[PDB]
Design an enzyme around this catalytic site. Structure first.
Site, PDB file in Angstrom:
ATOM      1  N   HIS A  99     -36.274  48.802  26.553  1.00  0.00           N
ATOM      2  CA  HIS A  99     -35.987  48.560  27.660  1.00  0.00           C
ATOM      3  C   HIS A  99     -37.333  47.189  28.262  1.00  0.00           C
ATOM      4  CE1 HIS A  99     -35.656  50.154  31.782  1.00  0.00           C
ATOM      5  NE2 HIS A  99     -36.996  49.515  32.358  1.00  0.00           N
ATOM      6  N   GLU A 100     -38.662  47.826  28.104  1.00  0.00           N
ATOM      7  CA  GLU A 100     -38.974  46.754  28.289  1.00  0.00           C
ATOM      8  C   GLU A 100     -38.816  45.133  28.249  1.00  0.00           C
ATOM      9  OE1 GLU A 100     -41.444  47.311  30.995  1.00  0.00           O
ATOM     10  OE2 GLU A 100     -40.932  49.605  30.797  1.00  0.00           O
ATOM     11  N   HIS A 103     -36.479  43.222  30.467  1.00  0.00           N
ATOM     12  CA  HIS A 103     -37.195  43.005  31.248  1.00  0.00           C
ATOM     13  C   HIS A 103     -37.996  41.515  30.964  1.00  0.00           C
ATOM     14  CE1 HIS A 103     -36.702  45.988  34.760  1.00  0.00           C
ATOM     15  NE2 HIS A 103     -37.319  46.730  33.673  1.00  0.00           N
ATOM     16  N   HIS A 109     -33.301  47.072  36.451  1.00  0.00           N
ATOM     17  CA  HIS A 109     -33.069  47.819  36.515  1.00  0.00           C
ATOM     18  C   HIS A 109     -32.146  47.889  36.762  1.00  0.00           C
ATOM     19  CE1 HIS A 109     -37.475  49.349  36.819  1.00  0.00           C
ATOM     20  NE2 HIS A 109     -36.660  49.497  35.472  1.00  0.00           N
ATOM     21  N   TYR A 155     -32.005  54.163  35.749  1.00  0.00           N
ATOM     22  CA  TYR A 155     -33.014  55.051  35.812  1.00  0.00           C
ATOM     23  C   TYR A 155     -32.165  56.590  35.175  1.00  0.00           C
ATOM     24  CZ  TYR A 155     -37.170  52.927  38.490  1.00  0.00           C
ATOM     25  OH  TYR A 155     -38.289  52.180  38.759  1.00  0.00           O
TER      26      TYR A 155
HETATM   27 ZN   LIG Z   1     -37.935  49.649  34.433  1.00  0.00          ZN
END
Ligand SMILES: [Zn+2]
Length: 200
Positions: A99-100, A103, A109, A155
């Site tokens: 996930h990071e 980014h 998101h 999320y």
């Molecule tokens: Zn995030």
């Protein structure tokens, strides 16, 4: 869910051989096992994308993995040393690390996509006020991909909820669709990387 920047000084450089080689260093704070966990998560990009995270030699643009407050990353290539936080206590899990790294590639998101109101309702009154900004809609480059409830970038329904049972996000028109998985990258997650970085 990609950031909008025309120049691609904003994004990691693609080599003539097609590979997007992203240099990194991992803080000496991490044990050998923790380094292995981070590098294991990086390998998840190898099979189906042209992204390659490699140990830094002396490249100018690179990711510095550090154990700071929570799990976070800068968006895209920022120029020079850019930090990515994998807190040792709460972030040392493959899916979270992936996930990071997404980014760092330039992805935001899922719930902030420009088209999000056709797929989710943001329940503002249920959200910790200081954290509400994380739910702001952005002018995303959606790369001709659809909203993906199963994205590793979405999320969970209780993210930043003030209290149990009062969800920050409700999928519409079916509230029962799962959101917030951190197992691995979805089909659209992978496709988006390949479209943005023109992987062939
Ligand atoms: Zn995030």
């Amino acid at each position: 869910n990609a950031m909008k920047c025309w120049s691609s000084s904003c994004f990691w450089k693609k080599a003539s051989n097609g590979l997007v080689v992203i240099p990194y260093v991992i803080s000496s704070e991490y044990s050998g096992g923790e380094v292995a966990t981070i590098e294991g998560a990086m390998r998840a990009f190898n099979g189906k994308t042209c992204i390659r995270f490699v140990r830094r030699t002396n490249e100018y643009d690179f990711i510095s993995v550090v154990s700071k407050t929570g799990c976070y990353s800068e968006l895209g290539r920022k120029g020079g040393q850019q930090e990515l936080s994998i807190n040792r206590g709460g972030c040392m899990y493959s899916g979270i690390i992936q996930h990071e790294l997404n980014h760092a590639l330039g992805f935001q998101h899922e719930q902030t996509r420009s088209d999000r109101d056709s797929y989710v309702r943001i329940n503002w009154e249920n959200i910790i006020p200081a954290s509400a900004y994380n739910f702001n809609k952005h002018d995303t480059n959606n790369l001709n991909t659809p909203y993906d409830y199963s994205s590793i970038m979405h999320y969970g329904r209780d993210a930043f909820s003030i209290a149990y049972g009062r969800d920050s996000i409700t999928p519409i028109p079916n509230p029962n669709v799962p959101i917030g998985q951190r197992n691995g990258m979805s089909r659209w997650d992978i496709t988006r990387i390949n479209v943005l970085y023109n992987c062939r």
